[PDB]
Subunit: 263 residues, 3 copies
């Protein structure tokens, strides 16, 4: 149903069955399929395509020429009714593409809240983007990629399938990420390698001096101690007993499937 307080431009095509929330705005020449849900206050500026089984939260801003919910580019996909979930207060800029999941990959592409997806960012099938992330222009995720909370990916950068971009990471522009990036790390290059802790980001986000020091010491265990990852894992868990922020490493290690980026 279309809420009586939603605006649907006369040139937009909203198919029967679409759910449009209160005070939403569907601009001219938008197309909205019958399995789409658009939350309260969300705006589709103009020339937006939203289709598939796709749920969009509240107060989103989706700019012209974006394609949300579309058939993914995985040759394995065969038209199965997979899904997209998008949270609240995202800014989804011109030409962004967010594609539906695959059965093989779990059936769901998910984006959280308060993200900024810049022009022509690409969220492939089965990706999971967290909250407060930034993808700069042309940032490109292959299928099954995770971008964890607060992570930032610079312009022109691409991420290989299944990689994890950890929480509070900063990936430089013009980079190619082929392995997993631990939380709190700065990464850059082709292929991307680690350049220490994202100290300034943690500072601005309220991390204490003690937490940042512990995170720097965990970084040193991984990349400067010379031990194997299997040796350092319990040392990082031990450190997390005192500084809970360090637990992000433990949680990341359990999800990592491609190994860590390294010098």
């Amino acid at each position: 149903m279309i809420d009586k307080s939603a605006f649907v431009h006369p040139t937009a095509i909203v198919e029967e069955g679409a759910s449009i929330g209160a005070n939403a705005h569907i601009g001219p020449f938008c197309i909205v399929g019958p399995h789409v849900e658009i939350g309260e206050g969300t705006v589709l500026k103009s020339h937006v395509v939203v289709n598939g089984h796709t749920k969009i939260g509240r107060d989103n801003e989706i700019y012209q020429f974006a394609s949300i919910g579309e058939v993914n580019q995985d040759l394995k996909y065969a038209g199965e009714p997979t899904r997209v979930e998008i949270g609240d207060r995202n800014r989804i800029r011109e030409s962004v593409t967010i594609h539906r999941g695959t059965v093989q990959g779990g059936g769901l592409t998910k984006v959280g809240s308060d993200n900024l997806l810049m022009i022509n960012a690409h969220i492939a099938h089965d990706c999971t983007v967290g909250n407060r992330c930034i993808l700069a222009n042309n940032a490109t995720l292959a299928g099954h990629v995770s971008v964890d909370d607060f992570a930032i990916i610079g312009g022109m950068t691409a991420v290989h399938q299944f990689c994890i971009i950890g929480a509070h990471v900063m990936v430089g522009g013009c980079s190619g990420v082929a392995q997993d990036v631990p939380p709190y790390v700065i990464a850059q290059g082709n292929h991307a390698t680690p350049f220490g802790v994202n100290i300034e980001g943690l500072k601005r986000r309220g991390f204490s001096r003690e937490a940042i020091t512990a995170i720097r010491n965990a970084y040193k265990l991984i990349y400067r101690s010379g031990k194997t990852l299997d040796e350092v894992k319990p040392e990082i868990a031990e450190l997390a007993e005192t500084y809970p922020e360090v637990k992000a490493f433990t949680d990341f290690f359990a999800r990592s499937t491609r190994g860590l980026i390294r010098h």
Copy 2:
């Protein structure tokens, strides 16, 4: 003429003279010029611009915000009535651009069949794309580039004008190709350099063990023997007398104008 079994959305603008085949589908807000031919079963999803002297085959899927047949970006082009040809069963994704040829370059941009052109791939004037190719997101061909059968070009990769991407090549993502890539080769980097034979691709495509061995031996002649290309050409032709797959090298050498990528 518009076939009686084609669907033309009421908001689409199909100019008189366009030819639309049986069971084709022209979605909302598409524009189709008077010299366009769209084959049987081809679908333009929505918001597609097709113009120029442009022939499109059957069972193609062309997604929103694509521009097919448009004026090319060569400053030498002056509006002459050049052409685009596109074959059958292509998947041409959001924002792909395929531009018309130039008189200077032969007048024709051509794409074969069963290709996958991912989001914002660019096929410049006078390019020739074969069959069963893949161009990943943002893959960008300058003018006059050839992409031969089964070749794959990774995300964010660009190819300098006139280069040949040989048959069954795999070019990595985040790469810049400045010279010609022999058939069967893996290439990666900025600028791209060769990394051996695309063994896994040949395996999956039915090449025999003997053919792959001969191709590996031809690769060694080119890049490991230390001889000049002029010395190895007759040695490769000799090898092709027994293994016909090796003839692809000979045919490629005759077309190559920029020299081969090298370490």
Copy 3:
């Protein structure tokens, strides 16, 4: 007001207050906001969004899926009524984005005349593009970037915020520019470094043999003499006393805020 000789397609939406000049053409499914001025003879092909306080000159060609005047991507921007200015005879290709300024950055994004902005080029808030420039496909300017007269930026290349791309520069494709590029220089790489003087460009643009020699000698002072920039500045000014073309260096040095690209 809409000039009586302008064409406005029946499907276009031109908001009351927009100014459309003589013999302009607003194609199907374009949107033009109430504070837009479109000059005499300018063409919006189709599916173009123009909004904000945006002035566009005469004889421009703006292709489908372009977004001109749109809200910028700077998180600091809060909706203030900033501006875009675009000159004459520009070719602005599919999916180009040109964004409005920020109060913090001066309030104005400006593009001159006779530029070629290829597919998906991005002109961020507060950028200044001069005359006769070329941005190739996917060339991406962060905020506050200057691209001076005749400069060319190759495909897939991105420029870090506040950088200056000097007059008659040629930046290669697949490059990342993190510092300022002096006039007349060839730059390439990630990050971009200098590769001598753009001799061929100067030749084609009518520079005398004496002027090019002096420019080459100024280049040598900067990058080959081994002196500091502070030592060479007066030596370059001295050279400019005889060869006025060398003054471009002096003017550039006074604007440069990020240091020069270097080997």
